[PDB]
Each structure stands twice: as structure tokens, then as C-alpha cells.
Hints:
Keywords: Capsid protein, Helical capsid protein, Host nucleus, Host-virus interaction, Ribonucleoprotein, RNA-binding, Viral nucleoprotein, Viral penetration into host nucleus, Virion, Virus entry into host cell. By secondary structure, the chain is mainly α. It is built from 18 helices and eight strands.
Amino acid sequence: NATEIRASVGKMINGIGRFYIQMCTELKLSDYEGRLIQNSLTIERMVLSAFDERRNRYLEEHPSAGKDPKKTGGPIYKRVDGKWMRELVLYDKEEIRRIWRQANNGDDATAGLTHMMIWHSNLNDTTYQRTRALVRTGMDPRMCSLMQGSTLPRRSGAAGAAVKGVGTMVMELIRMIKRGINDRNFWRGENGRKTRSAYERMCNILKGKFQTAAQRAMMDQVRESRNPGNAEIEDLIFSARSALILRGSVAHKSCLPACVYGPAVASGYDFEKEGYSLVGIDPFKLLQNSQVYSLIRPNENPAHKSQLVWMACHSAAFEDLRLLSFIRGTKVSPRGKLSTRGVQIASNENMDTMESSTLELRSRYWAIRTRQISVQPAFSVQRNLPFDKSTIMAAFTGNTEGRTSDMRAEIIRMMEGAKPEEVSFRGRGVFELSDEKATNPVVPSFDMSNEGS
RNA sequence: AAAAAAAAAA
């Protein structure tokens, strides 16, 4: 029921805004800096730690320059006498749940935290790429594709599971495979249920992302295997090479910083009355008139970091830059061209040379966020052009084989052409901001001079 | 109803 959904999302974002207002008011940040991105990431880490597990004191090799469970603080940067300064005394965590249950006066907002994580997810994904798994596990050159989705560091992401993308899901199989390559020998006993069941369900869902029943049954046949090994790994690798053209149903969730909902509940926003539309115009009209600023480091382009936060809010990193560009009204360039580093501020970075800058998060046109259209008609027909050469040498890849079975005939038939599906299809539904009812769409005209990625 | 377990980020 979409009605209760928009009701509940209005409620949760209203609760977020209220908790926003209060959480600020304690430490008393002035509202210009109270609607600012650094306090945005502070409250974000607070809601990151808000609902934890049992009490744990266990510590592992390589301490983290320290740790304390009594209370928790965050990077604090305040413009004092016109000059910013970072400071810290820590703040209790129980108190946090006490204030959060007051904000969600009687029923807490779990999906609210999921949506905050959604904010975090496009933030981190668009930010950059780390490769510590690369220094740990062996990995195929899938990165070479230059196109890969990524998950956040949040366990038990049942909701995340829906939005989730495919490539990193196979990677997650590989992560369990790493736990199993460093398998503690002393692990014989009841243990195995959670593992077998988890493998079952994750394999299920990774299969369920796409459509064609062939790879569905292939993924089931990898499932029924009792002892996952490198043969399963290479089978998943083919399946990934295919997923390149037979893309997965990777949905995109749009979320903004909480310093926007805060002044939006301060903007007399009766969210529930209109509801909210995470897939809808609502983030855009909220951002169209919002006011968010960010500590631009030295040698950084306000516009580049502006587009970075724009993508963090639109969940648009794994989308065609041409479309984004046509939607914002100014060229959306590859992250590499962004004269900017991460929005966060490493605790070592000096504040002496730090400066703030206004975020430009507006968009010329608006557009909806899908993952079905048979063939998007281009005025001069588009093809989703068939570049299948790296897949030629991929089907070669040392001439060993594809998935070895009837699948091999299925792949030596998929070789040529079937026109049965699409790939990386994020529906535009582009409209003028002056056309809220989305009465007339705008056939986009993209500049081919823009790196597709 | 009844559902898994470790470490900071350019």
C-alpha cells in the first residue's frame, strides 16, 4: 500500500528532523552551522551507533590508537570569532537512545535509520574507491569494467538487501569464502546452520535480482553444492561477466543530509500530510530550496564537491553521467575530474587552512529513479550499443571454459544476439520543475562528448 | 511467533 508507505516515510523523516533539531540544540551549534554538513556527519555517526548489540569489551590485535565505551564524540568544527576550530568531549550512548525514543515520541524509526544509511551509502559510494579487500582476498579484474556497485558497512541489511547490487553480492560470497579459507580448524559442532542457511538465502537473492531463468538455475546449481570452492568462484565470475550486459535489478535510493530535514521540519513541513516520495520529486524540491554548506579544503573546487554531494543525495554514481548532466543542467564529470577529495575531514587534516563553501544542490530538471520499458525510443534510435569484445576474450579467458554444463551451449548461443533484456536501466521520467504533476516529460539530448562514466 | 558476527574513512 503506497498510501501507508508515504504516511510512514513522512513520519520517519519528521522524526529525523525533530531529533536533528534537538541533537544540535544541546551542544548549541548556530543554525547556519547548525544546518551544516560536518554536524550532519556528526549526528550521522550518532545515529550510526544508536542501536548496537550486547556489551562487548573484546579487543583484537592492532589497536585503533584507542577506544572507550562509556561515551562517544564526533569531529566538532565551529566558526569561533570568524575562525573555525575542532574540539571534543565525548557524549553518552544510552542518553542517545533516551533522546531518540523521545524524538520518535513512542515508536522508534528503524526505517529512518535505514534511510540515513541510504544517505551514507551514496555518500561513500560516490566518494571514492578503497581496495583493502584487494590486499586481503584475490580478486578478478572486474574493476576493469570501471562500473561496480558497493555496500555499506552495516550488518543484517534486510532492507539494504532489496536495493542491493549484484557484483558486490558475489563479492560477499567471496567474503564468506575468505572467512572459510582462514577457517579456524577448531570449528566443528552446531556451527554450520547459520552458515548453510545464510549461503542458501544470499544465493537465492543474488539469483532473484535478475530475470532470465537460465542463470537462475545455474545459481541454484551453485547453491546445491555443499563445499564452495574456486570452481564455484570461476562460475560466479562468468556469471558476473554476463551480468555486465545482463545487468542486475540494482535499485537506486535517493537520500539527503539530515541538516536538510532539520530545517525542513523547521520549514513548517507537515510531511505526513503530503507524505514523502524517496523515488519522487520530494528530495528535489527539498534540495531545490535547501541551504547546506561544506568545509571546502584548500585546492578544492566548490563546484566539484557540490556535484559530489549532489550525487550523494541522488544516488547517481552508477548512473550514466549524460543523464545526470541533462538533469542538473551543468556537466556532471567523472569523479576523477572532480577537483575535490572526501566530504569528511580526517582527524589529522589541519583546520588552520580550512574554509566553508555553499553547496549547490539544485537541478534544472527533475527525474524519477527506477531500477519496465521494452525499448526506450531515441529520436534517432538508440541501441544500448553492443560492445561485446572483452566478453569475447572473457569467454576465452585462457580458453578453459564458461560455466561447464548445458550452460556452455547456452552461452555459445547467447554469443550472437537475442535482444531479450537490458542493462543498467535507471528510468529518467525527466520533467521541468514547473511541471510537478509530471504532465510533460522532456526527451533528453545528451552531449556524446561526455565520458559515459 | 522464532531470522548472521569485528574494526576509522581519500
